N, CA and C of each residue as an Amber inpcrd file, in Angstrom:
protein
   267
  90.7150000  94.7720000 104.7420000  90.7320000  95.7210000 103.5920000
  91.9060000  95.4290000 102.6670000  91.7150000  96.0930000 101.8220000
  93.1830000  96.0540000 100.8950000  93.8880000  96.4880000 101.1010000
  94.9410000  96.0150000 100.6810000  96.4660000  95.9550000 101.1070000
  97.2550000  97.6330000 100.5900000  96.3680000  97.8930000  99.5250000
  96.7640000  99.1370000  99.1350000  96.1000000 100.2700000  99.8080000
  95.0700000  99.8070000 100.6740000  94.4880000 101.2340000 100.9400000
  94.3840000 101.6280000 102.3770000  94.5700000 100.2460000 103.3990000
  94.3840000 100.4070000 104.5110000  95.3940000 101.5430000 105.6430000
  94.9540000 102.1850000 106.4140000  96.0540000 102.7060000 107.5230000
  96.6620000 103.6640000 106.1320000  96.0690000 104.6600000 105.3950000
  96.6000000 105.2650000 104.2830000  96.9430000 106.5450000 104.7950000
  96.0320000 107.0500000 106.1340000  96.6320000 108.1490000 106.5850000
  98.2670000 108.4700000 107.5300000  98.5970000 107.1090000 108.7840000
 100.0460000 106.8210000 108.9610000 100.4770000 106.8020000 108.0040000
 100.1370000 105.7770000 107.1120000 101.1600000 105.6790000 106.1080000
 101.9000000 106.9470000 105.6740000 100.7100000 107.7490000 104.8740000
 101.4100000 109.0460000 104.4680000 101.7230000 110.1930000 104.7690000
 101.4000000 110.2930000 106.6150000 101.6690000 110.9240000 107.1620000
 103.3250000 110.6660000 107.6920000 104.1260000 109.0010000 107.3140000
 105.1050000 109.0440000 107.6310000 106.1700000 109.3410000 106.3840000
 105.1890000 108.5860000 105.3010000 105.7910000 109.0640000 103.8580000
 106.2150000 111.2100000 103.7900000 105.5450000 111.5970000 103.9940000
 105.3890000 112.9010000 104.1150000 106.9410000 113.3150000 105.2030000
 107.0530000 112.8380000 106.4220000 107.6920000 113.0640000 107.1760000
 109.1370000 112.9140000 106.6430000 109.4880000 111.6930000 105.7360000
 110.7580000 111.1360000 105.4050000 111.0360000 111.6380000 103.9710000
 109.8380000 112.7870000 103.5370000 110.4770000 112.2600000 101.8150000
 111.6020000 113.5770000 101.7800000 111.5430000 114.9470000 102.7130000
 112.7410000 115.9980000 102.5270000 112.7340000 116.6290000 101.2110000
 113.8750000 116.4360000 100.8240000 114.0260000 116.9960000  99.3430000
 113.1900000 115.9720000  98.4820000 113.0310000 114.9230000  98.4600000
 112.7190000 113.7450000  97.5910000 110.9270000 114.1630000  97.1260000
 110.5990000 114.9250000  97.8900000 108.9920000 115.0810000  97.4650000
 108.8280000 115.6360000  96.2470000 109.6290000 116.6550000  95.2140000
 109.4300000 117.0030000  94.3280000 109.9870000 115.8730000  93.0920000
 111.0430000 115.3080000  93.0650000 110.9960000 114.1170000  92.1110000
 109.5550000 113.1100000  92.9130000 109.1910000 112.8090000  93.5040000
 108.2210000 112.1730000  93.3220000 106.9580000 112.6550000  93.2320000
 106.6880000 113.4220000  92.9180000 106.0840000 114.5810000  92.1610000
 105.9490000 114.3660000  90.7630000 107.0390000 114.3160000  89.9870000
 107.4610000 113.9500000  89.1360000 106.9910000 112.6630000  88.3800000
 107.2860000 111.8210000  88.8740000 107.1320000 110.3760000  88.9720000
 105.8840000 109.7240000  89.4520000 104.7910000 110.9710000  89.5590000
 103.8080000 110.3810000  90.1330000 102.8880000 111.6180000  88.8870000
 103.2970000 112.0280000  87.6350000 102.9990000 112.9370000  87.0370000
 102.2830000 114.0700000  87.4010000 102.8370000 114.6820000  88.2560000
 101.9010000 115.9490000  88.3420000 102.8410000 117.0890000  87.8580000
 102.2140000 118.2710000  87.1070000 102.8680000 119.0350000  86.4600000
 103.6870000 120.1360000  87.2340000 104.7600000 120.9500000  86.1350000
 105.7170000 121.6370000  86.7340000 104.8070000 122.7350000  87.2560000
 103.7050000 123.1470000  86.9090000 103.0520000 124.3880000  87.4470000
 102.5080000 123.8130000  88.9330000 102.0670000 122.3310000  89.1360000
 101.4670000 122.3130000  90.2970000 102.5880000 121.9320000  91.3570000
 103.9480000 122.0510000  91.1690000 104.6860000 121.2760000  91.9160000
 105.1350000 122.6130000  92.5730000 105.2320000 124.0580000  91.2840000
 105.8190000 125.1820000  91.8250000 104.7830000 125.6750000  92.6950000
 103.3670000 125.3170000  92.2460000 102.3470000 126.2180000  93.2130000
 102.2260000 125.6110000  94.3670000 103.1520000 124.4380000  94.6310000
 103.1490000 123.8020000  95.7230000 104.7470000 124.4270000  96.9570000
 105.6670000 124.4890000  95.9220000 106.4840000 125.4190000  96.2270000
 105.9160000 126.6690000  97.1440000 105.5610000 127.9220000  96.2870000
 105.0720000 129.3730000  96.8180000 104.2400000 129.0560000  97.7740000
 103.1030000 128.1410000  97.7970000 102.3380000 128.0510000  98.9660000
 103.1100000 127.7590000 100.2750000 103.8510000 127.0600000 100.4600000
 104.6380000 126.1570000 101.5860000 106.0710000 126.5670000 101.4560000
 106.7300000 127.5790000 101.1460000 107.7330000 128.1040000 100.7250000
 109.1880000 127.9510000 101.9720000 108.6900000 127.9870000 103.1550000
 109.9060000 127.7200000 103.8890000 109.5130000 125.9810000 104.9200000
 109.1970000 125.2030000 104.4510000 108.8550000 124.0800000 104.9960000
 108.8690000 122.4290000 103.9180000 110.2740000 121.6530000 104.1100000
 110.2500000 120.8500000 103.4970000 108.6690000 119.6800000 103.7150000
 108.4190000 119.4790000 104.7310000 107.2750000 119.0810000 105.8170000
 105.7610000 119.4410000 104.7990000 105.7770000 121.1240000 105.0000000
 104.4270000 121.0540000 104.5290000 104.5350000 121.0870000 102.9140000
 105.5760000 120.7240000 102.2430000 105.2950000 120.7210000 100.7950000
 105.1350000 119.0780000 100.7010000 105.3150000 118.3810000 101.0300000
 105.2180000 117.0120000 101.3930000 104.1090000 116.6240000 101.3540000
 103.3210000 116.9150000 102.6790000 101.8130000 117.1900000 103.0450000
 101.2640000 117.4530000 102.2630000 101.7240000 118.9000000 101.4360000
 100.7850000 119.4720000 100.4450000 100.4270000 118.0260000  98.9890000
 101.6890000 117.8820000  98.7070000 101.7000000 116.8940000  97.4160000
 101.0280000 115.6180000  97.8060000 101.1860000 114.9370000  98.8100000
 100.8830000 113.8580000  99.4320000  98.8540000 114.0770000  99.1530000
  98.8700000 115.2820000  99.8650000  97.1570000 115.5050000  99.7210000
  96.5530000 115.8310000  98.2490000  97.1160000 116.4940000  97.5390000
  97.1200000 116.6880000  96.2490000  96.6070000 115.1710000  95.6650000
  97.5900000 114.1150000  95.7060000  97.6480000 113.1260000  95.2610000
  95.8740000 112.0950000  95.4380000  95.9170000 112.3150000  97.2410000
  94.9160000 112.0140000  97.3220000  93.4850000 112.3440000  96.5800000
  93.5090000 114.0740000  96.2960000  92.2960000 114.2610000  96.0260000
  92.2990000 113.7720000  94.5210000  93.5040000 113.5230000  93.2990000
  93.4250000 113.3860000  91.9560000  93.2350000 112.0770000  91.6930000
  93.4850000 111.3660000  92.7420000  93.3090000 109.7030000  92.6990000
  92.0360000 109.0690000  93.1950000  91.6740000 109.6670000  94.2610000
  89.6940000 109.4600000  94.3820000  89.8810000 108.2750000  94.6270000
  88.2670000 107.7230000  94.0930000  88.6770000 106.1040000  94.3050000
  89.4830000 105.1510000  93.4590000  90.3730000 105.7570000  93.0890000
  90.8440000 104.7750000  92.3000000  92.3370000 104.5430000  92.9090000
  92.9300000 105.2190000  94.3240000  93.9340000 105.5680000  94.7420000
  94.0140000 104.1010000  95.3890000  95.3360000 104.0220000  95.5110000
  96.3550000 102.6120000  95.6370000  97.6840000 103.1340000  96.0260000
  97.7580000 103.0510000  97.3070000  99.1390000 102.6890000  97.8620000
 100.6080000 102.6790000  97.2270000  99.9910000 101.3050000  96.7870000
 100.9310000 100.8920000  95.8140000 101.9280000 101.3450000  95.1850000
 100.8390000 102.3060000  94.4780000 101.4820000 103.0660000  93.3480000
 102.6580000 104.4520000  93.7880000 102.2290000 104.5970000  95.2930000
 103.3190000 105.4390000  96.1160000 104.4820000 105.0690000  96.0850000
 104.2720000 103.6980000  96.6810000 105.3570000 102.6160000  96.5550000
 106.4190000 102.5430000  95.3520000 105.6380000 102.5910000  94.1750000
 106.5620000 101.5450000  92.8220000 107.3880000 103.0730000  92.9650000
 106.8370000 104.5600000  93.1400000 106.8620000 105.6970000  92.8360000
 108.7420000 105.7990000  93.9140000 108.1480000 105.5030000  94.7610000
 109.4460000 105.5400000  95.6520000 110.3590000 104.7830000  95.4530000
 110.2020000 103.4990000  95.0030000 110.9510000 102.7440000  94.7610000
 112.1180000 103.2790000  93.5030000 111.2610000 103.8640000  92.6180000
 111.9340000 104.4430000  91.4170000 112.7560000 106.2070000  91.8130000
 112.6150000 106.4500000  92.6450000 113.6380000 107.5680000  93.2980000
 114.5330000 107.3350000  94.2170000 114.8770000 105.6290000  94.3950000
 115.5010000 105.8710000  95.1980000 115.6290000 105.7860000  96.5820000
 114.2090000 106.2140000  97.3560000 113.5740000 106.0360000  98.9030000
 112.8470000 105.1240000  98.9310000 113.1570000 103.6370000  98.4710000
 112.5980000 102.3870000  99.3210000 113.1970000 102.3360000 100.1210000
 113.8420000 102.7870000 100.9220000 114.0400000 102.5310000 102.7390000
 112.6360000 102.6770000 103.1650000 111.7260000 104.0260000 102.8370000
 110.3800000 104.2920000 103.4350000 109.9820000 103.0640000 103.1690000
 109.3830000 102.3710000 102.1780000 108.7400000 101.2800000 102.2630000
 108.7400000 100.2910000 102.8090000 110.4550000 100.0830000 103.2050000
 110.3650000  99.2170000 103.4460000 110.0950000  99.5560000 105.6620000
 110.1800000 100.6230000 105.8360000 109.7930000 101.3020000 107.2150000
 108.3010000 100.9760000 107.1910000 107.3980000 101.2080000 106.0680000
 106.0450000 100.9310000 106.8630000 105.4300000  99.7790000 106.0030000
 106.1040000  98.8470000 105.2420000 106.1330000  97.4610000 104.9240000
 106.7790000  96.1270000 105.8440000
């Protein structure tokens, strides 16, 4: 399979695990708006973990088939947390 899509659930189930505070700039950086980042906030309100999860899945459903790895990647890379990448690269 492709390189961008394979093993996408580890992947972002570890992405999710490591991003902490970092999930809302990449949020950011992966354009999703200030209303969906806060409604991601109130939903998941005491859990760095499940706001992670939450955005991580978010991502999935707005990207469909056109979703690429990758683009997690360049995303992390530009905040800062390529250590993750380079953990499941």
């Amino acid at each position: 399979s492709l390189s961008g899509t394979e093993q996408a659930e580890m992947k972002m189930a570890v992405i999710s695990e490591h991003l902490g505070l970092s999930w809302a700039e990449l949020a950011r950086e992966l354009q999703f708006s200030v209303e969906d980042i806060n409604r991601i906030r109130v939903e998941n309100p005491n859990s760095l973990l499940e706001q992670s999860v939450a955005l991580l899945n978010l991502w999935v459903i707005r990207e469909g088939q056109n979703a690429n790895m990758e683009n997690l990647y360049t995303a992390l890379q530009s905040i800062d947390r390529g250590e993750i990448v380079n953990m499941l690269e």
